[model samples]
Target chain A: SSSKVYKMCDAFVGTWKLVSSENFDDYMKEVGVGFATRKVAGMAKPNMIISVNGDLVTIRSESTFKNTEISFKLGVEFDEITADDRKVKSIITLDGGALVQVQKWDGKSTTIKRKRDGDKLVVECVMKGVTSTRVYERA
Target chain B: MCDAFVGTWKLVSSENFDDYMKEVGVGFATRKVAGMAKPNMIISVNGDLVTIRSESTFKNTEISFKLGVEFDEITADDRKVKSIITLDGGALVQVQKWDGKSTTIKRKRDGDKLVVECVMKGVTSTRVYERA
Candidate 1:
């Protein structure tokens, strides 16, 4: 009868532009992303547009190379695709002030955690024990 | 707030679901069929785990997971991915990331109504379910 309470996901709404990134080359390496995709991802400035209505949240990742958008209800299971084009089962949850996302593939798993540090939005992406961090600034 | 959501729910109405499917890259024909199907669900809690059973004329999906735990999930669309469920206020929030793309889902209990909201590619769809 003791269920841990979780946090809502509304503070994440707004536009965030990429400011800095780390360890993406290795991150993409593990995902086996093609060189072209990795090159575009590194060169293009990506902007994440988030919108919230009640419990519905939409995250649109935009860039000069390729733009992808996903709309999801807070706690329901929906199919999702990744930037590198590898299909994985994914879900996002709010933990305190951080937005935690877990993605599952065949035998691999990845975790992407986003938190607001002051005005900067920091995302920590972890896969196969290799972690990459990307920071974004509000737009 | 917690006791408000433990009950049976039946689908009543949906809006913009077709566009929602389009954003997620679902086939036009399959989206057409899915848009016309009405689904019912029953959600209940046992210990620290929650069980959700979704039923429709087309297919049925049953999921069980403990809060905050990540596990493999096969969506009704037959796409395999990872899933996690969290509770907020009176709402249940789920997030899925796959193939480098991700989406979020929110389910809430409103009076005698169950509302499901899905967001993908900047488009949003809302579905309403009434108590059975």
Candidate 2:
């Protein structure tokens, strides 16, 4: 039971390298990201480092272009500035063996779902009618 | 001039910060994360008010106050402290008090560098920054 509990809470805790992305540019455009930022972000392959200490979870995305990190407790809302510089209120919660994140700003919202499949962590980002999928492999 | 400290400064060296944070009662995880961060300090002055902002990849914090006046400050480590800042000669001196404990931070210009020293419970940490 202890091992099961640990796995359930810390399933996403590790470093992951970006493998591929689909429709990411269009999704960034839907969120009104600027040209230069979109260009740089599109070409950058960032590594995501997820760690947990007690109830606090930290997600750090690192790349040569930029590095950003967010630390939060599950089910608690916090303010965040995205890499594209959007000031948003974000919340993450565990849902059905997946990590779901919702970000709201300027009356607009987006959802990101992260699910682990075998050795891959698949992320689905949805904004407006555009949906982008990014895949990462454990490193 | 009193405004000599006004500029954007990037951290170049940090020494003994982990011991300083431990002395200030920071948790292990928080200390580890904060130790890895190299923050930029932006100092600005408008009239009698001075603002010092720290920006880093992990977190950002800002403080604005008049010289020699005490104010409440929530530090980056989430400590609620009573803080007072003063300019002594060309150096900026800050004192923070909480729960009967206190710490002192001094920022002074050394040649072309900005040197910050933090002292707590006889432990001292030094961080040096370069003009950005």
Candidate 3:
């Protein structure tokens, strides 16, 4: 059971340094947010969390600059809109432990996931048939 | 009665059943209590996963699902139910498509307040509610 697996591995919790980010372009562009708003977010800081309840998942995105959190079923679809841009309210959970959502404005919600591949902490975002994967190391 | 569940659903409201556990700061104890609760649940899902809304008079919770995938389920009593979701996919042919990976959800008014349900898992759960 998952009970034995995820037992408060704080390495997975607490705030980590927001080293760098991606996906601000297409996501904000489709949401109808002006280029200016998109640029502001690009320059701002973005941080996130993956809270768990057994197998359930809640991804909380907070920042000293802009903050937002989204909750989703592992693979279920739901409505979503980013604070920086309301591109997607419809989302889906995907393989690779990633939370995927499609912002209906153009049928793309952009994919975001927290993963550890090799020695890097990986944060990936995909949308409109395009995906940008961000790599971060522990602070 | 369960057929009424043959639609889409959105979490109208929720209360964390694990707040007590989270507040006491007893990480172990809180996690145990939270992991054990099923609570009052109402949800819709495809084989891919089910959309759920669970509650008690004191609290409420909501989330979605997918088989073999560990998903987060926060309940109304403040307890969170995190487990792998599976669906029976019984009657609705349209629902069978939900059996794969994809999350598409929308919520609208039925009449009095709101109707919460989802398509998938051939089977449907009880339509849970909250007084708006």
**Most accurate candidate by TM-score:** 2
lDDT (10s digit) by residue, model 3, range A62-118: 554454445665556665545653534455545444334444545434456556555
lDDT of 2 by residue, A53-108 (tens): 55666777888766666767789976666767676789998888888999998899
DockQ scores of the candidates: 0.03, 0.13, 0.12
Q: Give the share of true interchain contacts found in each model.
A: 0.00, 0.00, 0.23
Q: Best to worst by TM-score, what's the order?
A: 2, 1, 3
Deviation from native of the Cα of residue B24 in model 2, angstroms:
7.2
lDDT, residue B13, candidate 1: 91
**Residue B1 lDDT, candidate 1, scale 0-100:** 52
The runs of at least 3 residues in candidate 3 whose Cα sits more than 4 Å from the true structure, single-residue gaps closed, are A1-15, A85-87, A97-109, B1-78, B81-132
| Model 2 lDDT at residue A103 | 98
Once fitted onto the true fold, the runs of candidate 2 whose alpha carbons sit more than 4 angstroms away are A1-7, B1-8, B12-114
Greater TM-score among 1 and 2 belongs to 2
Q: For residues B1-132, what per-residue lDDT tens digits would candidate 3 score against the true structure?
A: 233453433334433424433432336654665445434434343434345444433323445444446544443333443445433342211121111332212233455434334432232222334332
1 or 2, greater by lDDT? 2
Whichever of 1 and 3 has more lDDT, that candidate is: 1
Candidate 2, residue B45: lDDT: 69
